[PDB]
Amino acid sequence: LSKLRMRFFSALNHTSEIDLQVLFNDLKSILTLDSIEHLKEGSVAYAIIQELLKQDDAQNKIQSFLHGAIKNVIHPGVIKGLTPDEINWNVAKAYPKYYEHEEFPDVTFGGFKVRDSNEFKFKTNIQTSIWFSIKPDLFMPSKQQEALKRRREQYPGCEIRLIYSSSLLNAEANRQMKAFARKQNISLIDIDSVKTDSPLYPLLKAELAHLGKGGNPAAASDLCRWIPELFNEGFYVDIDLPVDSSKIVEGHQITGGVPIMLNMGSIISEPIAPHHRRQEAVCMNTDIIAYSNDKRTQKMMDTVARYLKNIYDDPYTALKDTPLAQTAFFNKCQEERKSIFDLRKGLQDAFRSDSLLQLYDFLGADKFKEVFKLKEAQSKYINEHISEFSEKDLLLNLISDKPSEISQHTLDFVKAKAMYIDIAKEHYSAFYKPLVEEISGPGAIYNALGGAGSFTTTHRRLTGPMLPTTPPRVLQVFCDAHDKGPFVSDNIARWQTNVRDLGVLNREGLSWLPS
C-alpha cells in the first residue's frame, strides 16, 4: 500500500480538512503510482479538490470525484501515453462544473480541425533519417555516423531507418554505406529505387541531379519528408538530433489531435502601446516530424506536397519578401522564368566572382547602395556612369564621393577591393538560406499548414494548469512533436519564450549552406 499511501498523502498535501486515510482506503483499489502524478499541485484534479475542500460534504464528494476521475480519465490516459497536459484537459472536460473553463477553439492545421480526442497514435521507436552526400567518395561524415551510434544507445531497441541516394556515391562509398548499415542494424532505403506517385519525387531527384549547379541536399531531404511511401509511421528526425532518454515513454506510443505533428514553439513579444498587449507567435520546424499510423496522414501529406509542387513551379512568389528579391539578379531570373537551381547557382557564382562590377550587376542600384551604405549623390553618379566604368572607377567611387581627392599613389587597390568584396559577402547566407527554407523547408511548410498568421494570436497570462483554450495552447498540447517525443532540438524557440530570452538558435547547425 504503503509508499503509495505516502505519495497519495503528499500529493493531497497532507490535508486534515478531510480524513486522507479513510479516503485512501476506498481508493487503494484503483490508485497507482502513475495516477498520483496527476493529482499533485499543478494538476486540474488537485485544483478541483481544493475547491471541494471548501464546500460541504467534502469527504464524500472528493471520494466520488477521485474514483471517477482515476478510473475513467487518468488511468486510461496514462495507459494511452497521454501527457500531463492532455490528462489535465480530459479531467477539466469531464468535470466542467467543478472546473470552469473556456471552450476548446476551432484551429485549422494543414486543413485539419485539431481534435481533443487523442485519437491519433504515433510510434516513438521507429525513426527515419536522411543523408544525401555531396561528395561521391564519402557515404556520410563522421559527425553523423557518431550521432547514429549514439542514438542507438540513448534509445535502446529503436528501429532506425536511413534514406540515401546510391547515385550520389561511387562504388566504394556505396559499399561503405551498406557495410555501415549492416554493422549498425540500420534499415537502408535507396531513394533512387522508391516507387511513388508523389509530385515531390521528380523535384527531389532534380535537386540531387543539380548538386554543384544550384541543387541542395537539405532541399532534397526536405522534400522526402512529405512522400507517403517513405513516411507513414514513426518519426522523421534530422540525423544528428539527440534523444533525451528521460522523455522515452513506456509503451513507445504518444497521441495527438492531428495526423502529422512537428517541432513547435512560440515567441511572446514585449507589451505594445497603448493597451500593453503582448502577442504570441508560433514557431515551427521540420527537424522533428511524427506521422500517425492513421490513413488521414496521407491526406495531410498530399495537401503539403501540392503546396510544395506549386512553389517549385513558381518560386518567385514564395521568395517575394526575402532579401534576394531586392536584387537585379532576382528580377532578371523572374522575368526569364529561371528554375530555383539557376537562381541558387547565380547567387553562389556572384559571390565567388571577386569582381565589384559583377557584384553591382548582381545587386542592382538600390541594394548596392544599401550594402555599401552610399550617399544619394554617390549612388546616382555610379548608376549614371557605371555603363562606362572599369573595376577601378567603381572602386574609387566606393572609397570616396570625391574620387579625385583620393591619393591613388598611396592607395592599396588589392586590399581596398578585398575589403569591399568582404562587406558584400557578409550577406551571402541571408540571400541563400531562404532559397531552401521558403521553398522546401520550414518556411514553406509553415505556409502550407495554414501558417502562419492564422496562428498568430494575442497572449494571455496563465493562471492555473495550462489548458488548450487558445490556438497556440491547442498547438502546444495536441500538435507538437518536440516536447512529447524523445528528441531535443535547439533550432527554434521552446514554447512561450519571451523575446528577450530567445538566445542563439541552432548553434552548431547548418551543414547545407555551400561554401
Q: Rule CB under 6 A: is residue 266 a binding residue for ligand BGC?
A: no
Q: Rule CB under 6 A: is residue 259 a binding residue for ligand BGC?
A: no
Which cell numbers in the block locate residue 16? 486534515
Instruction: Give φ, ψ of 485 to 5 degrees.
Output: -85, 175
Task: Kindly state the helix (H) or strand (E) to which residue 208 belongs, with its residue range.
Answer: helix 200-209
For residue 359, give the 3-state DSSP assignment: helix
- Residue nearest ligand UDP, Cβ-based: 509
Count, residues in the chain: 515
How far CA 430 is from CA of 212, 288, 418, in Å, comes to: 20, 24, 20
Q: Is 10 annotated as a binding residue?
A: no
Task: In angstroms, give the least distance from the CB of 511 to Mn ion.
Answer: 8
Q: Rule CB under 6 A: is residue 510 a binding residue for ligand UDP?
A: yes
Q: Rule CB under 6 A: is residue 285 a binding residue for ligand BGC?
A: yes
DSSP 8-state code for residue 229: T
Mask: binding to ligand BGC, 70-109, rule CB under 6 A, as x and -? ----------------------------------------
Q: Which does 511 bind (CB under 5 to 8 A by kind): Mn ion, ligand UDP, ligand BGC, none?
A: ligand UDP
Per-residue DSSP letters for 113-157? EP-SS--EEEESSEEEEE---SSTT-SS-HHHHHHHHHHHHHSTT
Q: Is 512 annotated as a binding residue?
A: yes
Q: Rule CB under 6 A: is residue 217 a binding residue for ligand UDP?
A: yes
Task: Kindly state the helix (H) or strand (E) to which residue 303 belongs, with its residue range.
Answer: helix 296-313
- By CB under 6 A, the count of residues binding ligand UDP is 16
Residue keyed to cell 464528494: 61
Task: In angstroms, give the least distance from the CB of 433 to ligand UDP.
Answer: 8
Burial of 219 (0-12, 13-18, 19+ CB in 10 A): buried
Q: Is 238 annotated as a binding residue?
A: yes
Which amino acid is residue 34, in one-letter code?
D
Task: In angstroms, give the least distance from the CB of 465 to ligand UDP.
Answer: 33
Candidates 234, 441, 468, 486: give the one binding ligand BGC (CB under 6 A).
Answer: 441
The Cα–Cα gap between 131 and 506 comes to 19
Per CB under 6 A, which region of 39-47, 342-350, 351-359, 433-441 contacts ligand BGC? 433-441
Q: Rule CB under 6 A: is residue 438 a binding residue for ligand UDP?
A: no
Helix 471-478 vs helix 84-94: angle between axes, to the nearest 10 degrees?
120
Per CB under 6 A, which region of 37-45, 185-193, 401-409, 437-445 contacts ligand BGC? 437-445
Candidates 436, 448, 466, 474: give the one binding ligand BGC (CB under 6 A).
Answer: 436
Residue 372 or 512: the one with the smaller Cβ distance to ligand BGC is 512
Cβ neighbours, 10 Å, residue 192: 12
Residues tagged in the binding site annotation: 130-132, 238-239, 506, 510-512
Q: Which positions touch ligand BGC (CB under 6 A)?
A: 218, 221-222, 238, 285-287, 436-437, 440-442, 491
